[PDB]
Amino acid sequence: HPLRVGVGGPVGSGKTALLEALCKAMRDTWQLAVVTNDIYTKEDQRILTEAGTLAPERIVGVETGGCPHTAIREDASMNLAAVEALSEKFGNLDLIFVESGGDNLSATFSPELADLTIYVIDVAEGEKIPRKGGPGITRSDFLVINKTDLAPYVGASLKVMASDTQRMRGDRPWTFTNLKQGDGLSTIIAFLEDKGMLG
Amino acid sequence: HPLRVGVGGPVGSGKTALLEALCKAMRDTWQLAVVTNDIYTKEDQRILTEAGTLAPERIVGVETGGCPHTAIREDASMNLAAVEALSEKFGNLDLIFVESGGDNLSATFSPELADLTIYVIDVAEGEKIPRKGGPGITRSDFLVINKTDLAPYVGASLKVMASDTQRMRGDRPWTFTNLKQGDGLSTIIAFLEDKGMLG
Numbered sequence: 001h002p003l004r005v006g007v008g009g010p011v012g013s014g015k016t017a018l019l020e021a022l023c024k025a026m027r028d029t030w031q032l033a034v035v036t037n038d039i040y041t042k043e044d045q046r047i048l049t050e051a052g053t054l055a056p057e058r059i060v061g062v063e064t065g066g067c068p069h070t071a072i073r074e075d076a077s078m079n080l081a082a083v084e085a086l087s088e089k090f091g092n093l094d095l096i097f098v099e100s101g102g103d104n105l106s107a108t109f110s111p112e113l114a115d116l117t118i119y120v121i122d123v124a125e126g127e128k129i130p131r132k133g134g135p136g137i138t139r140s141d142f143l144v145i146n147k148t149d150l151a152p153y154v155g156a157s158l159k160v161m162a163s164d165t166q167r168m169r170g171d172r173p174w175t176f177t178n179l180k181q182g183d184g185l186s187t188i189i190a191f192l193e194d195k196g197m198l199g
Numbered sequence: 200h201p202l203r204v205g206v207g208g209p210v211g212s213g214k215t216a217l218l219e220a221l222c223k224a225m226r227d228t229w230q231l232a233v234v235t236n237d238i239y240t241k242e243d244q245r246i247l248t249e250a251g252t253l254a255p256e257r258i259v260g261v262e263t264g265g266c267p268h269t270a271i272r273e274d275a276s277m278n279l280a281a282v283e284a285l286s287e288k289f290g291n292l293d294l295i296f297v298e299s300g301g302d303n304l305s306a307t308f309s310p311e312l313a314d315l316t317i318y319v320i321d322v323a324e325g326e327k328i329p330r331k332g333g334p335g336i337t338r339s340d341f342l343v344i345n346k347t348d349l350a351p352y353v354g355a356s357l358k359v360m361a362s363d364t365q366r367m368r369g370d371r372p373w374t375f376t377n378l379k380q381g382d383g384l385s386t387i388i389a390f391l392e393d394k395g396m397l398g
């Protein structure tokens with residue numbers, strides 16, 4: 001049975017960009033599928049399918065209504081059914097990603113739905129976002145701080161963000177990324193293959 | 200009694216920057232106060248106070264816990280009491296802003312708490328955010344699309360975003376802003392003075 005990786009974070013932080021890059025880099029080694037969530041549309045399913053990240057039948061969209069965290073935590077029924085339909089259809093899957101709808105800082109995945117959690121924030125949301133806290137920043141299995149290339153335009157210091165993040169997470173891993181260039185991707189891939197116990 | 204203006208939007212879109220700019224521009228004509236919200240911190244209260252947007256006692260922070268939308272919609276009692284205390288303390292306020300915690304695209308203010316709503320998204324969240332919809336984009340009294348200066352770095356077309364916004368909102372007013380520079384504020388001020396019936 002496949003590892004379920006939940007990818008969460010605020011609106012626009014780079015979750016879909018992360019899935020696209022991970023799928024393109026890992027799909028020749030591992031059998032993958034993706035469940036995307038959005039409240040009102042299936043836009044991210046279309047984006048990932050049109051980008052060719054995986055074959056279309058490996059990418060499923062769920063339109064949740066309401067809060068994204070409800071669909072990944074309080075009532076995960078739809079996402080669990082979609083994961084079941086994929087696992088039964090493909091049989092040999094190693095890893096299924098679930099992209100949350102973008103949400104507020106209190107949102108996390110239920111352990112019933114996600115075996116590992118990646119939380120994605122981005123620098124343009126502000127230097128102080130790590131200090132504003134929440135379980136995505138403090139307790140996710142892996143935190144991604146994306147869009148470092150935008151730091152000079154919003155006036156954020158990456159040294160400050162790194163210090164604040166370390167104060168919030170202790171020994172729990174995190175990395176800066178620039179998903180436009182792919183910077184920081186290989187380390188996330190290594191974390192998934194290891195802590196996800198792939199193979 | 201003062202006009203209550205709710206300012207909502209996803210994490211990091213520029214709500215506090217908008218409040219800073221509106222306060223600095225409007226405070227010489229109108230008597231203002233601000234209630235800031237966040238889930239785990241009072242950081243935005245500190246940020247506005249340190250920026251000198253208003254005197255310290257005109258800016259009150261509420262730490263909500265849970266989802267930001269609960270505090271501005273389903274159970275707004277804490278915010279309602281903070282708005283009432285500011286109104287009684289200052290006696291003659293024309294307008295009180297309430298900044299939501301950054302949230303998902305389904306978040307709105309109850310009419311009990313907000314007379315007018317401003318919803319703030321930003322270009323770095325993606326060209327496609329207007330199309331992802333929701334009542335903040337489609338039904339808010341005024342929509343702000345902030346951080347236009349970041350469009351070339353994220354690869355977003357403002358022409359496309361404007362076309363999609365017109366389809367989502369019809370004639371309901373909106374504007375692009377660059378709050379780093381102050382562009383676009385005059386439209387928002389004129390809307391508040393007119394539809395807010397100030398004076």
Ligand SMILES: Nc1nc2c(ncn2[C@@H]2O[C@H](COP(=O)(O)OP(=O)(O)NP(=O)(O)O)[C@@H](O)[C@H]2O)c(=O)[nH]1
Pocket residue numbers: 009010011012013014015016017018044101102103146147148149150177178179180181323324325326331352353354355
């Ligand atoms: N400059 C820059 N832009 C980035 C980076 N990562 C993503 N972007 C841009 O950021 C925007 C949002 O990316 P996207 O992957 O759609 O984020 P999301 O978190 O999936 N959005 P949603 O919450 O709607 O699902 C896009 O315009 C994308 O090009 C980065 O590292 N640097």
Ligand SMILES: Nc1nc2c(ncn2[C@@H]2O[C@H](COP(=O)(O)OP(=O)(O)NP(=O)(O)O)[C@@H](O)[C@H]2O)c(=O)[nH]1
Pocket residue numbers: 124125126127132153154155156208209210211212213214215216217243299300301302345346347348349376377378379380
């Ligand atoms: N380049 C640029 N940066 C902007 C603009 N508006 C805001 N910023 C930057 O964007 C980041 C977030 O702004 P902020 O006002 O804190 O947003 P917010 O929506 O109030 N955040 P929160 O959801 O945490 O309350 C800050 O680093 C701020 O400097 C803009 O138009 N252009």
Ligand code: NI
Pocket residue numbers: 015016017044099
């Ligand atoms: Ni996405």
Ligand code: NI
Pocket residue numbers: 214215216243298
């Ligand atoms: Ni703010």
Ligand code: NI
Pocket residue numbers: 067069266268
């Ligand atoms: Ni919620």
